[PDB]
Symmetry: D2
Subunit: 283 residues, 4 copies
Amino acid sequence: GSMNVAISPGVTAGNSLPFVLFGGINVLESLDFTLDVCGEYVAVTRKLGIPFVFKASFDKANRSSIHSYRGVGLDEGLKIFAEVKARFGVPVITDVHEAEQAAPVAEIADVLQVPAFLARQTDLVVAIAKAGKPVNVKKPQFMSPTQLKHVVSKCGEVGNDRVMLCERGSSFGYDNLVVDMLGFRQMAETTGGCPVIFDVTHSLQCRDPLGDASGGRRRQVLDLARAGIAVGIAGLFLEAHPDPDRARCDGPSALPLHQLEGLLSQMKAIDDLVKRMPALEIR
Amino acid sequence: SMNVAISPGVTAGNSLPFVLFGGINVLESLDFTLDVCGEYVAVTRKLGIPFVFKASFDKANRSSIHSYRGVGLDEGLKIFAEVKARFGVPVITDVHEAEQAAPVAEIADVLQVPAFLARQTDLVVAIAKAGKPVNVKKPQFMSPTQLKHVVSKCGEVGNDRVMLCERGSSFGYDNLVVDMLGFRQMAETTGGCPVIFDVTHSLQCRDPLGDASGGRRRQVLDLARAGIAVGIAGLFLEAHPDPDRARCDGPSALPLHQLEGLLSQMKAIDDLVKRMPALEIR
Amino acid sequence: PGSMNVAISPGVTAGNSLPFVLFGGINVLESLDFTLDVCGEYVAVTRKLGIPFVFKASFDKANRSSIHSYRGVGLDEGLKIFAEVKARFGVPVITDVHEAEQAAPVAEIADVLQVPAFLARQTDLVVAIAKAGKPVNVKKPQFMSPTQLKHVVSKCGEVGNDRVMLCERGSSFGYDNLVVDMLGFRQMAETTGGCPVIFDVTHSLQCRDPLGDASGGRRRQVLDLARAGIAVGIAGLFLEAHPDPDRARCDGPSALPLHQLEGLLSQMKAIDDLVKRMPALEIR
Amino acid sequence: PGSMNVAISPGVTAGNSLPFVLFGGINVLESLDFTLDVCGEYVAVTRKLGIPFVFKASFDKANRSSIHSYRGVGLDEGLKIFAEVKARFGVPVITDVHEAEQAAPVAEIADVLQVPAFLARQTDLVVAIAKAGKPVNVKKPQFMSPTQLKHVVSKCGEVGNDRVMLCERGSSFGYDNLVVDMLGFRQMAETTGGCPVIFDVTHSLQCRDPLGDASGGRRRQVLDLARAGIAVGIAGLFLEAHPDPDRARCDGPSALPLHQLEGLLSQMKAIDDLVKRMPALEIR
Ligand SMILES: O=C(O)C(=O)C[C@@H](O)[C@@H](O)[C@H](O)[C@H](O)COP(=O)(O)O
Ligand SMILES: O=C(O)C(=O)C[C@@H](O)[C@@H](O)[C@H](O)[C@H](O)COP(=O)(O)O
Ligand SMILES: O=C(O)C(=O)C[C@@H](O)[C@@H](O)[C@H](O)[C@H](O)COP(=O)(O)O
Ligand SMILES: O=C(O)C(=O)C[C@@H](O)[C@@H](O)[C@H](O)[C@H](O)COP(=O)(O)O
């Protein structure tokens, strides 16, 4: 049933295809820093031969605290993304928080992401689907893997069949996430084989009961990225930073950028292996 | 412990007699809304319970694209205007987009932040700025000690009239549990905001492959009794004369003819607990 | 009808439509005099308020996390202490049983035998406890859904013991934490033919530090949770106390300070008496 | 360094940096010939692929939900069957132990003793198992966080047994369901001085109907989950199989169909060999 989603020339995501890296940074802060980090990803993915889509958010619309950093915002963010595409020739993914942002974002971004908390919001999902690019649906922490089909259906109803499904963990007691590795197959099979993507970064989130900003578990990114990629999936979603303690959002879960090549060579080796091993029909 | 004045004769607070935020899931038509609200007004008047009428003008978050959404903003506000004028009752409704807050606030007396949207800064701020009391539905994914940050967003733009509404926490897949310990944690970490218990939505559960929410209305009294016994500012309740025919959340709706039987138990328990001291257990 | 009553001792019968029974005491037996002194306080408070009473203590803590944590006086001394409690006060006692071979000797002295939470699926232990011929209090494991207790009740019934009570102590909620699902009480009663349901408010307050070596706990919130449970309409409350919970040798973080016993129990009786005279609604 | 190796028998050593050891077999001993036949299949497949092998079975299911469910041949017959398995195939065997007194006799025959998941906090059982002198496989309870196993390991260490392995079988996730937190493996290893971590893929697939009599399970997804766990880099995989899982008398819903053993194990070996030669990254 597997379905393949064409993102840009030489970049197609599909559960039986070599994995695609949706990699970048949490939030857009400035032009040069964005260009410099993206340059590193482009060089590392080109060297290793891994298909690549650059990620960043133009806005963090859901920070816990009114005081926390939100990013350069829509207008500056789209200008940064336009310069990233022209400099590197790389497709970009970003998240969309209001219906009215979908069309202008889709002029520049090559994939639009539905945020986890907002994936049940009909008018947002529909507006994102109608914008005419591939959609990455972040699976809410509150949503079981067999319920994503209804989000996919919303998109399908307005003529967008290019939908990918992104795991980022499930709520496990208070202030913690677990990743159910059994969910990847349930997402694919109940949606007609949509590409499934693993957000290893956000799956590492956890928090202090009284904290102002998310905690996170970057020291375990390889453990979890290994597990997910071994299942056999369309993509990996990853954020990095040269010094994660200085990141202005989700630093506790960000990969230190100098370890990108070390992580990706392990992902490519595991992915190339599992992608040539059969499923067993276990009845 | 902070008290929130909602309208004449209606003030909510954790040490005050509980306020019923009662009504129906979704606005469908004028006359049915008036008739159901009439029943709540009659029952609450008889029993002496303060009352705010609830309904949604839109269900913006249905699982399925094919599920019923309600009459929509323009018709919904017209219905509410008529409900207020006919019965003299304040009304609560939920707000899905920033731009809806100001027009909703012209008519509604309390604005509700939907559970899924409670982290959305621009929505919360827009709701806060509209200048009415705010009911924040606690997301299924949010711990009770994290609501303070939503309250602070509202406070930052000058709205100190914030209430916090329990509707359950995610418990495995497709199921909710209510942690009765969370009420106190919500109150104490937010400077004493009124805590409200949404017994209806706390009863939600679902089939892994279903198209619409399941629910456990047959257990509404068990859960309502438990929550009201803790000592809380309000109870949030939906009903329908025939819940199997409700177009949203019927599985968790109270059958309307049982409203008085339920409310007399809530009033009896609430009046008792509200005159019993806290023990300072150290 | 819809509800089964369990006779424990003269004037003490537990049932879901009856005035609640207090299964109250201390976590672990340490010495004769301290046990007698604490039980005396319970007896005086319960007599004054008119609450039926069964005194609780463990003779052994067979499941401490750490090999270095206190376990109690043990079986032989524990039963001697319980005999002296019964003779001094005329009160029935409840204690937990950890091995099949302990059931018969414990039943000579104790009036209710408790199956520990972790052990409730262990067929031979349940069957040996049922056979000893006293009422059984089954602690619902943190891992067990409320609709699965019926199988434990059936094990007991299979060897001729119909006198089974079901005790809530919370459900695992992520790591190192418990939540009490107040919807479970009815599910336990209805799927077992109306067995008495008991709420262990003390152990339901447990939680822990991920690296700790003994349980944490939330005694400051005992009244919130006890009020909630008793309002549902249940057969009993299970409660531990200590005069200084910080010095308790097991489960101090969840123990009620003993001087607050009367303040708590007067709230429980008031709520219980109210809800026990209010009808169920048949909600269809 | 950072990792401890446990010698089980000649040519079988389990350790987190070593090629993975398969603890494979059947849920419950029913008869001699069926046990021999199934073990023969495992031995042939593991010999061909070059995977170190320990044969698993239970002599008793002491924790069935239902008093009517099958329990197995029992201790005396079970040890006789194990003796024949060892003699015929030269393979070491692992079985679980349910009472302190069973530890010594089991240890005469079995090469690894397993502490059942529900019982892993029971001090006297853990100590008796540790004292019996063989390697211990601790099944991590569904209710226990990964950073709490250290206390079980310490109980064993206290009576002189340092040969302890830690076996994941899922964590309680709501009612009647399990999830495997793949982050736990490292936490178990690092907090216990590098004990071997083992993944029980079979029992991690358990789930149930709220009103059912016996466990449900998700065998159709065994490869997904086994791939994920083995990719993390672990000491062992624990697996049950049956030639026709629908007819298995315990845990059939989670059993691998036996004819698929080679297809599964070749994937495990390929993944394990790859990850075992790739470095950890020191992520700060
Ligand atoms: O940007 C993405 O890709 C996302 O998935 C959204 C994600 O970055 C955000 O939800 C952040 O995790 C979130 O704003 C951090 O929350 P806090 O640190 O404000 O508590
Ligand atoms: O109306 C309220 O007060 C609310 O709490 C919002 C609530 O009614 C909605 O989230 C509904 O519960 C929801 O749309 C039902 O979901 P489904 O039945 O479409 O799966
Ligand atoms: O005695 C009872 O009533 C029980 O419920 C058993 C209970 O007391 C015990 O499990 C204790 O809670 C337990 O041994 C203490 O845990 P820890 O502090 O050893 O981690
Ligand atoms: O034998 C093993 O390997 C184990 O882990 C113990 C395990 O087999 C048992 O807990 C069984 O899963 C259990 O007896 C079956 O449960 P039920 O079907 O009786 O509910």
